Amino acid sequence: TTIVSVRRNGHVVIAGDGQATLGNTVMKGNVKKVRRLYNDKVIAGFAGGTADAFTLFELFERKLEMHQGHLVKAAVELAKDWRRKLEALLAVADETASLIITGNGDVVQPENDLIAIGSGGPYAQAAARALLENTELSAREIAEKALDIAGDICIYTNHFHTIEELSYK
Amino acid sequence: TTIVSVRRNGHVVIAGDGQATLGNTVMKGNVKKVRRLYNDKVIAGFAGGTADAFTLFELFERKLEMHQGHLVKAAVELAKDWRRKLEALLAVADETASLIITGNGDVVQPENDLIAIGSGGPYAQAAARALLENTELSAREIAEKALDIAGDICIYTNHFHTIEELSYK
Amino acid sequence: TTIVSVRRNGHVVIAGDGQATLGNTVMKGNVKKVRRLYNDKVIAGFAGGTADAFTLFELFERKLEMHQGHLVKAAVELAKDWRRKLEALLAVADETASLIITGNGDVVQPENDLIAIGSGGPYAQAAARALLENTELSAREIAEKALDIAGDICIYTNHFHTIEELSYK
Amino acid sequence: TTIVSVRRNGHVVIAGDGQATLGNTVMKGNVKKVRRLYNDKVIAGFAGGTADAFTLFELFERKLEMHQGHLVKAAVELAKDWRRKLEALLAVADETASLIITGNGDVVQPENDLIAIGSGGPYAQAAARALLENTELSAREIAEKALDIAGDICIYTNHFHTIEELSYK
Amino acid sequence: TTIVSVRRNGHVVIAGDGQATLGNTVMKGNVKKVRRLYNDKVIAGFAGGTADAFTLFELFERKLEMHQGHLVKAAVELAKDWRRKLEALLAVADETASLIITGNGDVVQPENDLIAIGSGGPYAQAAARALLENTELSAREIAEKALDIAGDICIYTNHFHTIEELSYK
Amino acid sequence: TTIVSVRRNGHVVIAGDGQATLGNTVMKGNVKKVRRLYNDKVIAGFAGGTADAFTLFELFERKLEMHQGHLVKAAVELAKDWRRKLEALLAVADETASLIITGNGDVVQPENDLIAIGSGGPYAQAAARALLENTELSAREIAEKALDIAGDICIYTNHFHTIEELSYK
Amino acid sequence: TTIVSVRRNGHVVIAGDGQATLGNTVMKGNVKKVRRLYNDKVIAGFAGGTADAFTLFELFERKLEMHQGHLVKAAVELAKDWRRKLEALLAVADETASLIITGNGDVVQPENDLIAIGSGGPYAQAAARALLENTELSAREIAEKALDIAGDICIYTNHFHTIEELSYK
Amino acid sequence: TTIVSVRRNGHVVIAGDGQATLGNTVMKGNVKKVRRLYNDKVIAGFAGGTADAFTLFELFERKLEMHQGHLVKAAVELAKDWRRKLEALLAVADETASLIITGNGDVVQPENDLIAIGSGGPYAQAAARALLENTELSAREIAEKALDIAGDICIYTNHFHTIEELSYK
Amino acid sequence: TTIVSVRRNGHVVIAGDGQATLGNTVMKGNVKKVRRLYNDKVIAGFAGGTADAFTLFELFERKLEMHQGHLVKAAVELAKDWRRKLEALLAVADETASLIITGNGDVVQPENDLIAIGSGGPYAQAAARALLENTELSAREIAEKALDIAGDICIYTNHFHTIEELSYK
Amino acid sequence: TTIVSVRRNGHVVIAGDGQATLGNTVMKGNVKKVRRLYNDKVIAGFAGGTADAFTLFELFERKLEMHQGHLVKAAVELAKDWRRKLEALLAVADETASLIITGNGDVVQPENDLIAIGSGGPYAQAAARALLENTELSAREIAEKALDIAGDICIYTNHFHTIEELSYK
Amino acid sequence: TTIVSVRRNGHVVIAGDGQATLGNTVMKGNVKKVRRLYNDKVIAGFAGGTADAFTLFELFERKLEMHQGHLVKAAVELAKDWRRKLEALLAVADETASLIITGNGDVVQPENDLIAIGSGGPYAQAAARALLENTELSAREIAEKALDIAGDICIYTNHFHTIEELSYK
Amino acid sequence: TTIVSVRRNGHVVIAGDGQATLGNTVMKGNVKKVRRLYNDKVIAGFAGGTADAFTLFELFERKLEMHQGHLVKAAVELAKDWRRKLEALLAVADETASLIITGNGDVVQPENDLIAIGSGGPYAQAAARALLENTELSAREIAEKALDIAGDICIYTNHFHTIEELSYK
Numbered sequence A, B, C, D, E, F, G, H, I, J, K, L: 001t002t003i004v005s006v007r008r009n010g011h012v013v014i015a016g017d018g019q020a021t022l023g024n025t026v027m028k029g030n031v032k033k034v035r036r037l038y039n040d041k042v043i044a045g046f047a048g049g050t051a052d053a054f055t056l057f058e059l060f061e062r063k064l065e066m067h068q069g070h071l072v073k074a075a076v077e078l079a080k081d082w083r084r085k086l087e088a089l090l091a092v093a094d095e096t097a098s099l100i101i102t103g104n105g106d107v108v109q110p111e112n113d114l115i116a117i118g119s120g121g122p123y124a125q126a127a128a129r130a131l132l133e134n135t136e137l138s139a140r141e142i143a144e145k146a147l148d149i150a151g152d153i154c155i156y157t158n159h160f161h162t163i164e165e166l167s168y169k
Helices: A049-068 A073-079 A121-134 A139-151 B050-066 B070-079 B119-132 B137-153 C050-065 C071-081 C123-136 C138-154 D050-066 D071-081 D120-136 D139-153 E052-067 E073-079 E121-134 E139-154 F050-068 F070-081 F121-135 F139-153 G050-066 G069-079 G121-134 G139-153 H049-066 H071-081 H121-134 H139-153 I050-066 I072-080 I121-134 I139-153 J050-067 J070-080 J121-133 J139-153 K050-064 K072-080 K119-132 K137-154 L050-065 L069-079 L121-134 L139-151
Strands: A004-008 A011-016 A020-022 A025-028 A034-037 A044-050 A089-094 A097-101 A117-118 A164-165 B002-009 B011-016 B021-022 B025-028 B033-038 B042-048 B086-091 B100-101 B114-119 B164-168 C003-006 C009-018 C020-023 C025-028 C034-037 C042-048 C088-093 C098-101 C116-119 C162-167 D003-006 D011-016 D018-021 D025-028 D034-037 D042-050 D088-093 D099-100 D115-118 D161-169 E002-008 E011-016 E019-021 E025-028 E034-037 E042-048 E088-092 E099-103 E115-118 E162-167 F005-006 F011-016 F020-022 F026-027 F034-037 F041-048 F088-093 F098-101 F115-118 F162-167 G005-008 G011-016 G019-020 G025-028 G033-039 G040-049 G086-091 G098-101 G115-117 G160-166 H003-007 H011-016 H020-022 H025-028 H034-035 H043-049 H088-093 H097-100 H116-119 H162-167 I003-008 I012-014 I020-022 I025-028 I033-037 I042-048 I088-093 I100-102 I115-117 I162-167 J001-006 J010-016 J020-022 J026-028 J034-037 J041-046 J086-091 J098-101 J115-117 J162-167 K002-006 K012-018 K020-022 K025-026 K034-037 K040-047 K088-093 K098-103 K114-118 K162-167 L002-005 L011-016 L020-022 L025-028 L034-037 L041-047 L088-095 L100-102 L113-117 L164-169
Touching: A004 A044, A004 A121, A011 A089, A011 A139, A011 I033, A025 E073, A034 A049, A034 A164, A034 L025, A044 A164, A044 H121, A049 A089, A049 C098, A073 A089, A073 I050, A073 K034, A117 A121, A117 K119, A121 H139, A139 H121, A139 J026, A164 D071, B002 B042, B002 B086, B002 B119, B002 B137, B011 B042, B011 B086, B011 B137, B021 I020, B025 G086, B033 B050, B033 B164, B033 E025, B042 B050, B042 B164, B050 B070, B050 B086, B070 B100, B070 H088, B070 L100, B086 B114, B086 F020, B086 G098, B100 B114, B100 H139, B100 I033, B114 B119, B114 H088, B119 B137, B119 C020, B119 C123, B119 C138, B137 B164, B137 C071, B137 C123, C003 C042, C003 C123, C003 C138, C009 C034, C009 C042, C009 C138, C009 D034, C020 C042, C020 C088, C020 E019, C020 F020, C034 C050, C034 H071, C042 C050, C042 C162, C050 E139, C071 C088, C071 C098, C088 C116, C088 I020, C088 J070, C098 C116, C098 F034, C116 C123, C116 E025, C116 F011, C123 G115, C138 C162, C138 D011, D003 D042, D003 D088, D003 D139, D003 D161, D003 F088, D003 L025, D011 D034, D011 D042, D011 D139, D018 G098, D025 F011, D034 D050, D034 D161, D034 I088, D034 L020, D034 L100, D042 D050, D042 D161, D050 D071, D050 F034, D071 D099, D071 E088, D071 E099, D088 D115, D099 D115, D099 K114, D115 D120, D115 F162, D120 E121, D120 E139, D139 D161, D161 J139, E002 E042, E002 E088, E002 E121, E002 J098, E011 E034, E011 E042, E011 E088, E011 G069, E025 E034, E034 E052, E034 E162, E042 E052, E042 E162, E052 E073, E052 E088, E052 F070, E073 E088, E073 E099, E088 K098, E099 E115, E139 E162, E139 G025, E139 I042, E139 J001, F005 F041, F005 F088, F005 F121, F011 F041, F011 F088, F011 F139, F011 H011, F026 I088, F026 K137, F026 L069, F034 F050, F034 F162, F041 F162, F050 F070, F050 F088, F070 F088, F098 F115, F098 H034, F115 F121, F115 L088, F121 F139, F121 G121, F121 G139, F139 F162, F139 G121, F139 H034, F139 K025, G005 G040, G005 G086, G005 G139, G011 G040, G011 G086, G011 G139, G033 G050, G033 G160, G033 K034, G040 G050, G040 G160, G050 G069, G050 G086, G069 G086, G069 I042, G069 K050, G086 G115, G098 G115, G098 I042, G115 G121, G121 K025, G139 G160, H003 H043, H003 H088, H003 H121, H003 H139, H011 H034, H011 H088, H011 J162, H025 I139, H034 H049, H043 H049, H043 H162, H043 J041, H049 H071, H049 H088, H049 L069, H071 H088, H071 H097, H088 H116, H097 H116, H116 H121, H121 H139, H139 I025, I003 I042, I003 I088, I003 I121, I003 I139, I003 L025, I012 I033, I012 I042, I012 I088, I012 I139, I025 J020, I033 I050, I033 K040, I042 I050, I042 I162, I050 I088, I072 I088, I072 I100, I072 J050, I100 I115, I121 L121, I121 L139, I139 I162, I139 L121, I162 K002, J001 J041, J001 J086, J001 J139, J001 K114, J010 J034, J010 J041, J010 J086, J010 J139, J010 K025, J034 J050, J034 J162, J041 J050, J041 J162, J050 J070, J050 J086, J070 J086, J098 J115, J121 J139, J121 K119, J121 K137, J121 L164, J139 K119, J139 L025, J162 K025, K002 K119, K002 K137, K012 K034, K012 K137, K034 K162, K040 K050, K040 K162, K050 K072, K050 K088, K072 K088, K072 K098, K088 K114, K098 K114, K114 K119, K119 K137, K137 K162, L002 L041, L002 L121, L002 L139, L011 L034, L011 L088, L034 L050, L034 L164, L050 L069, L050 L088, L069 L088, L088 L113, L113 L121, L139 L164
Parallel strands: none
Antiparallel strands: A004 A011, A004 A117, A011 A164, A020 A025, A034 A044, A044 A089, A089 A097, B002 B011, B002 B114, B011 B164, B021 B025, B033 B042, B042 B086, B086 B100, C003 C009, C003 C116, C009 C162, C020 C025, C034 C042, C042 C088, C088 C098, D003 D011, D003 D115, D011 D161, D018 D025, D034 D042, D042 D088, D088 D099, E002 E011, E002 E115, E011 E162, E019 E025, E034 E042, E042 E088, E088 E099, F005 F011, F005 F115, F011 F162, F020 F026, F034 F041, F041 F088, F088 F098, G005 G011, G005 G115, G011 G160, G019 G025, G033 G040, G040 G086, G086 G098, H003 H011, H003 H116, H011 H162, H020 H025, H034 H043, H043 H088, H088 H097, I003 I012, I003 I115, I012 I162, I020 I025, I033 I042, I042 I088, I088 I100, J001 J010, J001 J115, J010 J162, J020 J026, J034 J041, J041 J086, J086 J098, K002 K012, K002 K114, K012 K162, K020 K025, K034 K040, K040 K088, K088 K098, L002 L011, L002 L113, L011 L164, L020 L025, L034 L041, L041 L088, L088 L100
């Protein structure tokens, strides 16, 4: 799996592949790993088992309403509620911030709001970081291009894309 | 990796992917796994390390000259010379026969001259066997279509193709 | 085990083998892995332990009545009730849709309503996909032929068949 | 793999399946695991890798000539020559005796000249022993029927047969 | 251990050995693994820990009274009450049917009412299947002879016998 | 540890050593591993951790009162109550019967009421069985002599003795 | 396996079982593990692979001639010649002494010329030691009775016997 | 460690880090992993043990003289001479070609003369590939920037650089 | 990770790196591992998962208010409340004392109020101890210099710093 | 860790080292492993984690008051609670008795009130036992000298001492 | 095993137990582990296999003659001849020095000519060191008393003694 | 084990501890791990087995004479002769340079001629680096003080010192 998030110029996106691997075989190639939440002003991407991550969605989407729609707090609260047999990673972003929510119940603020998680995560991070620091490409162009390179390199990442973008100020 | 060989209507082909995998990463995606030998009337495909298999080429191409270019004998003789470690598989075919030459030094005659070796071997075998018994497709069409399906399913097989065909009577 | 589902021309079928394996030995060779439900206009096939899957039947057949006989909703509802980790897979199809219901509680829509689950799943998928894209065979002919190839290749799949077909518009 | 040998009424046979398994997949289903030697008055069957066992053939067939055609001595001598990186089992029989030649270099005289080696060995032994002690069936009938049952039970044994019989006094 | 059940000509029997093994040592050699139930018109044999299986007896003998003495229903009901893992296997038979009740809570109808469970199960199955298909022996003779062979082959099965027979129409 | 129980001529005894071993070192050499229960007409010996076994005592001594002082029933009932994180063995005997109560919750009736459990169990069993079948020694003499031999042979058994005898009819 | 040697009243014997075990299955039950040497005034028993031990025979029988027939010296000399890829144990006795010759090349003088080697060795030692110290049985009676007990207890020892006795002064 | 090679516009460079890791500790941070050869018109970089790789240098620098200074042939010849207990990777480039020389004795032509080997190899490949396909940066700028990103991501790669450039035509 | 605490001349500091490692890759390099508490007269540093340690903060900051602001008691009370699925270390200091609060619920008083915890802990301890005993550097200078050396040596520690100082009497 | 207790001539002492080891590194060298309790007429020493053992203190010191100050009971009650994923040993002594309270919840009376627990326990036991049986040294002299020897031999025991003595009648 | 050597007042002794352990069982209890050499003015003790150590004897006794009878001489020369690698330890002493000769071919001068090797070595070292530093006992008394304590503590050491003393100036 | 080397102001030293550890016990505490070579103008220290390292001495001292006394060349030549690998580390220094010679046959030039190898190596590196960069201490003072700290922290390093110094220009 590979989930990428890039933020640039009042835009933020999350892109994910669609590969589901069982052993050395592809079960499915069109998995939707990126969705919108909270009246479509919150975007999220997941890596891991479809169940555990879907648990996290509701569990997170709940905390969003339960906390006004405040991204950071909703995530922080959730860090306590998971602190139990789940293994998945969650990439979450809105107009204000971008974070990662992990299995142990950690909440992580990526360095430049650049998120790259999954098996193919580090490869996408390398491509994204490169494009960020040496081009004037858009957050959507960078995330998409980084995801293709990751799929080219990671055996467990493909070339099916789901991309959700968020325009703001 | 995946190597397929199909024989039908005075034609015989060998098709192979181009993926070289190190761990979970792709080192190279355009490996040439299929070549011609002996004045281009013998075709061969390999699966395994580039070195050990290249050893087998020369070691086999030698026995071809050393034995008139009689395919079967040259292979059988080689079975003794490796009977010492090498881990690679060799698919070899000509106008007359088609065989597999393995690491332990075995020589195997496939059931209907259908060869499918490599990690993605079995999946290509299933696709080929289906096409063979249920279509009127050519040996080249069948091998190519089986190799794509194998690449689609096997994590260790890609969609780069090298195909060598041999027309005869 | 191998369960195959093919949909073509107002027909949909599910086919399964009959092998039950304990270690390296065959316990039973005539397991019924495919049944009809809901007044025989819903067909289902399972892979896994006879118990956990039979749990899923009732648990699913319940939701069918509880939800009008609506296939998709009944499955989606069940995804919550299992979200307690049973290890079986369920292939379910009717006139309208075809889905897979897994252990973690996921519900999956296969790409072209082609379902291939079990140990021998991928091999049947390869054969089915081939036949689908290169013949004019019926959904029943394709599923049966794909199941035989799977049984030929999978050590854990045999040649006992249970097939349930569904004619509609 | 199963190899069976039965001796009864001046007859002795060796029967073997044809399955070659790689992981959980069948590579080949028509392997010839039984042959004749020494001007066709010695029969042998093998279980294991095609190479190591083929080494044993020549290595054994050599000792046969080197020792007159005396079955027992030729085998005993071989026990020293292998006393080194081979893993295979050898079933050998003639007019006089029947033995097993193993990897460590042991030579074993089965209890009632009933030999059953391979993964499916014990199941064929049980069927054979039953038929032996409770029927008047021929050595060929017993070996064949025992091999089918073994193929039915062993995941690693099939229903392809190679049978070599030997009539004498 | 080994439990065998054979049904033939209005007779049904269950036979079991007496070996209790701890590590590589025999704790006890005269374990009673076969008993009668429900006014002695139901017979049962068990494989596993003496406790867990004895739990199953009462738990099963209960359902028998609770359900009229109907063998199949009593077993099916029990499949729910155990749905923890108990680790034992239960062989149960009467005038009407013969079944296996397992640890996960499965209920299994053997192919020809031939039951062979335990470590030595498969060997007894092979001998029984042979005798069944090639002799005219009684259900008691076949079960006993199959149990001896299993004890001869299985390290964990001995030659102490407990046999319960049931004559009917 | 070695606990021995012998029954002969209206007498029954239990004998145990006194060694407590931690790694390769002796912590204690005078452990009391044999006691009397239920107004001193029930004797018991244990092998394992001093805690888990002492749990078993009370848990067993309870069921004795709870069930009249009936040895067998009290033990059988206990088999359910332990069917959980204990690892110990219990040897229990009275005027009527002698049994072993194990960790999984099994209850075992030894072959000739001869009990030998612990690391040095099998050696004492061999000595006891010998004396039983070839001398006219008393149950106390046999158990004591078998325990010494076991201590001589087992690294984990010493020569400190605790013996409890029970005279009856 | 179990090899026993007892010396008493100008007699010395060696007794061994006949079981050959492969995994959990019995290959052969009538192995001859005890023989005579050097004009039948030297007896020997072995435990291990039939090959390595047979190597030891010749290698030892050689040193016997090479050293006059002196038991101890012949064994001691051999200790140097094996001081290399053999794993077997050798029990050797004559009119004068009794010893064990092991794989590392050690020569061991048992305590009271009582030898018990093999998997079932210790159990036979316990029975033998008991009989020795508490009966007036003959060396042949003791060894035989100890071997039966060992076969009763060891999973890897049977009840087939080969006994060689030696009468002297 | 990380070795990168980029070729663009009549330039070719090799860049490497300087980290030497022992366990989880840094032994040295200024290792020179890139050098010039053959009168400074051949550049090379290595990954692995300082010894084995230095062996490869001389062994390769030898073949360069021994073969005119022809890069490809000198490498191919070396592939035979190593076809033995070395574990290192070699990156080699000149005016004409760029190759990798591995431990098994393989010679690999990278896809677009882009070489990225070492633990941090794949991350540098992703950054380089990105810059190549989306900027107009120089081969030196790309290699340096890709090496920094690799050092940022790989625990086993640092930010010490050794860069050798080659201007031609 | 690496947390250092030094106390000297009415000053006490805590210094931590910023590296977050996942596998062999750096997720984040600017983690804040040191904070102030209780109206900024208590400083704390953590090592481990961001979640479990953040649990400890609140859980500890709670006990501070709950206990007057008494450092030692608040920590000791917490030792009971965690005596449960957390894995983190906590370095805590004020005007009066300095302690470590671990996962099992231990509270440890370091030897000279010198705290060095984390993967790079011991290396920082060595540098700090050296500086302490051989220079007149400030507690802040020592901690910072020790942290750099630790980051230079530990693969899992970087050179991002967060330092909190506390001036008192 | 090494805790020693010696009782002689109306005196009883407990001595412990101060080493705390993490991996192969010393975290702390002046740990206080011996304290006084219950108005300083009860002494105790611990071995293990500082937390779990400190739990045991309070848990034990509680039972002391709760039971009067009667040693045995306070310790026995504590054997409950630890009787819960935990590990620590406790040495406890007063004017009347001396005992060990372990992790499983056992209470052990040492042979001659000589207690030696911890990694270095056995070595101190050896030295103490020697001095006891061959000198007229005081209980304090013996315990101190035994502790030094243990620290000299045990890698996990040092030469920091904490000694608490108790004079009585 | 346990070998002790003590030197005091113109005396030097070597003491050893007699236990030979196979698995958890005692093979022999009266092994002679200490002998005299070189016209009985050199004493030696061994720990390990009887063979490898006996090799070392001759190999050492040889070098003694080959080098005048110079103890240190003969041992250092031997260090080269063993530089096999087979497993035994040798304790050697005369009028002048005392050394240990190990498997890798090291020669070690113990601290105060106190040698304690074997499984029970460290325990004897502790007892000896105690007695040495706190009594006026003889080298023979100390070694004997230390060996008993070691036998009491070590599971692999018994109370059979072989002691060789050497009086000089 | 710890070996430290510091070079400062025309001086260079090597310091090592004396601990030899077997399991968790100290075999010896006064091992000499540092010596002089080549007419006492070359100093060396080793870490590892006494044998393998002593091999390295002679093997290195040889190359010194064989190569004039040139430190670097003698070491480089040796790198080939070791390229069957004795597991040891070698620290070597003279007037000109300082290097490490490792087991795989690598030769490493430390960063500032500061060498710290062994289990306690990194701790001594931290202390040394600190002293170097923050004091005006001598190379001998720094190495000794760093070795003490390492011994204080490493469980496998003690406080016995061997120091060799070398004065030059």
